[PDB]
Amino acid sequence: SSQIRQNYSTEVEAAVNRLVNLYLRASYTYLSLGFYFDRDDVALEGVCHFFRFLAFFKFFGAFRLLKMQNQRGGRALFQDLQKPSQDEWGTTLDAMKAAIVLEKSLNQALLDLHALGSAQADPHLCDFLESHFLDEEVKLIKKMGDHLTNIQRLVGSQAGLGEYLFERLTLKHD
Amino acid sequence: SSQIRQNYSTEVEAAVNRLVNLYLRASYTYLSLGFYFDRDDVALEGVCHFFRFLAFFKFFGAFRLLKMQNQRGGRALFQDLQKPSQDEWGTTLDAMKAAIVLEKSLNQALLDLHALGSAQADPHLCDFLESHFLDEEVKLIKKMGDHLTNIQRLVGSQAGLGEYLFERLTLKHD
Amino acid sequence: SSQIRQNYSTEVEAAVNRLVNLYLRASYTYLSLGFYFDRDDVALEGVCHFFRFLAFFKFFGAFRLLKMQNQRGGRALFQDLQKPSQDEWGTTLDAMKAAIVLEKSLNQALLDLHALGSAQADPHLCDFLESHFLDEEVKLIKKMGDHLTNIQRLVGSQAGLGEYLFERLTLKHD
Amino acid sequence: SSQIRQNYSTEVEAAVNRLVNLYLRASYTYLSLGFYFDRDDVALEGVCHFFRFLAFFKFFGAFRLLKMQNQRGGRALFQDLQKPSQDEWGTTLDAMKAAIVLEKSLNQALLDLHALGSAQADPHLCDFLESHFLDEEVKLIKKMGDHLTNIQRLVGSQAGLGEYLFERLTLKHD
Amino acid sequence: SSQIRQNYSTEVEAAVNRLVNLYLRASYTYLSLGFYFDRDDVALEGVCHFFRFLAFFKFFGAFRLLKMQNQRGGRALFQDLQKPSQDEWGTTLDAMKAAIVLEKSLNQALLDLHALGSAQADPHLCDFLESHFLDEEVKLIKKMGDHLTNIQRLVGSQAGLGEYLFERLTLKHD
Amino acid sequence: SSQIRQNYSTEVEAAVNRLVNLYLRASYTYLSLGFYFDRDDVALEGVCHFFRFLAFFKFFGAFRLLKMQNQRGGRALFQDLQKPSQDEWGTTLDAMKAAIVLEKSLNQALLDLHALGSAQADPHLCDFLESHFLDEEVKLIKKMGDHLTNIQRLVGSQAGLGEYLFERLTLKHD
């Protein structure tokens, strides 16, 4: 069997591969979100840039998990990547709501894997998640919550004006 | 006849001269648009700057075509330049709509000339248009479409507020 | 319909979306190839680095196609991404053979789309492929062919020695 | 009526618009002159550069007049731009003679507008012309007269030799 | 057969090899032209430098074609190189006329190969010629036409004086 | 006759022209050798670079001889350039053997011309060869002999491994 594998359960190995799939799916979702906002009939550059950046960030998360799988002696296994849940993402508000829902799902998956590692007495795994994923996830969800609140405050009765102002004055553009 | 002319049809030569006229007309149109927005009773500096820049850009397109005519051994022939279609250009939205209509007409003229060059087995002409005009045109029309969408989003029920905000936060002024 | 779309066929729009899928599949394939060579029981860093780089390069190709779809007024549509053809990629030679097969398939897809654009009198599309994809593809396939020849020359009767030497002295590592 | 217009006659406003037309016509004339000398069968780069520069200079004069129209509360009105008087401009001597004739016509138009402003007790107009146009015009006509004299001195009995020498040793080229 | 060759006709491969021969012949012709003007009894350094430079430029064209042959999987085949058409090249005018004749022949060969690539649906070939050869050729023929006109203008009745002046004031010397 | 020619025999003049032909033939041979090693099915970059460099070096030798012909008042005469002896050059060993054979032939030609100059009491010629050709030739043949010995040492029973190692560790690449 593996010459380096030690204290690395089959259960954790499988869960890591599933988590890689989840992160790549999230990256793909953010890629779709970005290009939707880049449409000439949507045209919100700051929103495009926000989600494009998250596409890369989520890809990097998957990359780190895959590197860690190999570091531990596990075998990276790739599966089909489901397309995103939507072809069109509606308003900035709709999109940011979809993003927070996705991020909560990823966070729960992180917490689930952490719990499995704790149950299997796998502290390297637990520390890996703590050091590179849990706090980043909490920070990202807080930022999205901040955005949702500001987008919501701007809806009022002139949605287009508010949508433009949020993109121009909160989101980075360029 | 010409000591350098080779594989350069009379049809292409004439079409290039017509295209120069079209670009100079477009430049003149943008000059008028710019000075309209510079009026004390319109006063939208970013809109003035946008169209002034396009006046120069379209002049440069005509200049390149004229240089290419000479490079190929054709004879630059100038015609009268019709004045712009309007003396007053209305709102930013009206102006950006007129601009996109003009740009589509120029693009179709480019595509028509490309087709003629393809039919006449004139690859230098085809490459000239591809390298210096087709993509610039597509990029400019995309940018105008982006603007139209943002201007439209801002109209709502407070048109003046939206017109000001678009000029201040999207258009370059400074 | 679209405010910017001009001379952009439904056929080309669909083919671009299919081509994006093909490039993302190729990126995913190269991601798998890279992590296989990063395994402690394969351990060929230069080979890992070669394929990791191609993963990013192919992602960038998909990104460019998606940007161009939007520039032309088409609608980016994402589909499921099939997993790679293999979970384990064998020797460097096996992997480089699989890579050249994949690259030839992408090249044929580029040539097919170019032919469609030529038939539809879509010179922007044709120039886009010529300027950013055809030559890069030819250059990459030539490099892989060079590698295959050097890997093959090294097989002889001491395959492990040759596999190590190729990774150490040809491929960039570290 | 205008919120800024003060001491600005309808007569001056109209005359400024006519003068803009004259300057744009002159720019167009110089554009034609430049491209004629850029022909492979004329090939006098210094002469091409001289007239190209004047095309831009005359455009800038029109631009300044248009800015001043708006500064004063007048309305810029554009008219059709007649093509140049000739398609082919003959020798350098013929061209420089045509240029001096054109410049004298512009100068008389400046003097006429100055006289109108003096009659209408419009000192801003008078100072505008004095500060940005009268002396530039006198300086340009003196330079052309200098050139005409040197071109004439060179005609003698070897016109081609003289035409080449003037372009090479007087005119700026590279 | 070739492990990389794709969409590369035998007809194009052969034509590329013929074109390499034509460019090397042109380089050799320019080498002879340069050394003729370097003779103590001709002594026109600027003319020597002009043609020497073109010798290198045409060699570089052949080099690029040969690199492209290999990039595409074709086989470079070299043939005998015919000596130049003349041992002595007469006047600068005679030489520049011979040069423009040679350049037109190369240009027609480029156009012929482009047409073959178009007929064979070989867009890499077509783009290769468009990007690195067609415009360079048009620019070079325009420059020679410019020179021919200036040399012709100087002939008059004092040919030696004009020949010296052209070399000293137009051609670069060092 | 020549205004500068002094102590320059017709025999030496003719022999110099023959020697120019020999050097250009050698350059052409090295050009073919380089592009053979650049093939995707040969792929030895260091070997390609070695012979490409020699192509230029031998061209420079011909250039120097031609400059010297003119310096002495002789007339450069160009002849047809025979194609190389082979279309395919086999192994690195085969190629380096062919190169040393070619270089010995050039060296004998240099020695023959030196002997002719000595017999004709032409010390400028003799010094020209001594200063710019004899030692360069001896140094190049020594380097090739060094290479042949190292290539031969590597053949043993694993020729491919040795051929790769020589290219990677002796020849400059990357």
Ligand SMILES: O=c1cc(C(F)(F)F)c2cc3c4c(c2o1)CCCN4CCC3
């Ligand atoms: O030489 C130049 C430079 C410019 C410029 F771009 F700098 F403004 C230029 C601009 C315009 C011109 C012309 C121009 O001629 C000559 C033909 C008529 N015309 C009408 C449209 C605006």
Ligand SMILES: O=c1cc(C(F)(F)F)c2cc3c4c(c2o1)CCCN4CCC3
């Ligand atoms: O935004 C990015 C950036 C990258 C990267 F190139 F940086 F790795 C990236 C890479 C891959 C991706 C995706 C990626 O999305 C989203 C679609 C699915 N997918 C599978 C193949 C590998």
Ligand SMILES: O=c1cc(C(F)(F)F)c2cc3c4c(c2o1)CCCN4CCC3
């Ligand atoms: O490698 C080089 C470099 C040059 C150069 F451009 F530097 F002069 C070069 C130039 C010429 C050549 C060759 C040359 O081969 C080889 C083929 C025959 N040939 C005849 C025309 C002049």
Ligand SMILES: [Cl-]
């Ligand atoms: Cl599956």
Ligand SMILES: [Cl-]
């Ligand atoms: Cl008319």
Ligand SMILES: [Cl-]
């Ligand atoms: Cl689905």
Ligand SMILES: [Cl-]
């Ligand atoms: Cl009218």
Ligand SMILES: [Cl-]
């Ligand atoms: Cl033969």
Ligand SMILES: [Cl-]
């Ligand atoms: Cl012969």
